């Protein structure tokens, strides 16, 4: 229906806003674009499901997220990928892991403060009906 289409449109608007706020944070610059294979050729080898904030925006616009829960799975993926690819004790690796966890924590905190639980439940019930 139109009302359900309106619901998913509000979801996309909400998700773009959250993603924009993550993307403009200087700590998260490394997560804003896909990894350049010329600079890092072994990334595609090690990480089977690459994810970044530009790709999240593309997925929002392609209507790939019908719930905030599905969006958070991609946020979690950005974080888990970073933990996986940068596991060493070296400061470079520890910095990116800390930033990855901060990105995840920040996304969840924004959602906790600004997502109405009943809006998410409506999205989930529309999703499950299809
Ligand atoms: C998303 C991402 C981008 C990136 C770019 C350059 C270099 C690294 N890794 C640091 C090198 N260490 C893994 C040894 C990178 N690690 C990442 O996790």
From Swiss-Prot:
Q: Which residues form a coiled coil?
A: 108-130
| Expression induction or repression | Up-regulated in breast, uterus, colon, ovary, and stomach tumors. Induced in breast cancer cells overexpressing NCOA3 or treated with estrogen. Down-regulated in 5-fluorouracil-resistant derivatives of the colon cancer cell line HCT 116.
Q: Where does it live in the cell?
A: Nucleus
Where does the record place the Bromo domain? 3-114
Which tissues is this protein detected in according to the database?
Highly expressed in estrogen receptor positive breast tumors and in osteosarcoma tumors.
Q: Which family does it belong to?
A: Belongs to the AAA ATPase family.
Q: What does this protein do?
A: May be a transcriptional coactivator of the nuclear receptor ESR1 required to induce the expression of a subset of estradiol target genes, such as CCND1, MYC and E2F1. May play a role in the recruitment or occupancy of CREBBP at some ESR1 target gene promoters. May be required for histone hyperacetylation. Involved in the estrogen-induced cell proliferation and cell cycle progression of breast cancer cells.
Q: How does it assemble?
A: Interacts with ESR1 and NCOA3 and these interactions are enhanced by estradiol. Interacts with acetylated lysine residues on histone H1.4, H2A, H2B and H3 (in vitro).
- What name does this protein carry? ATPase family AAA domain-containing protein 2
Report which part of the complete sequence is shown: 981 to 1108 of 1390
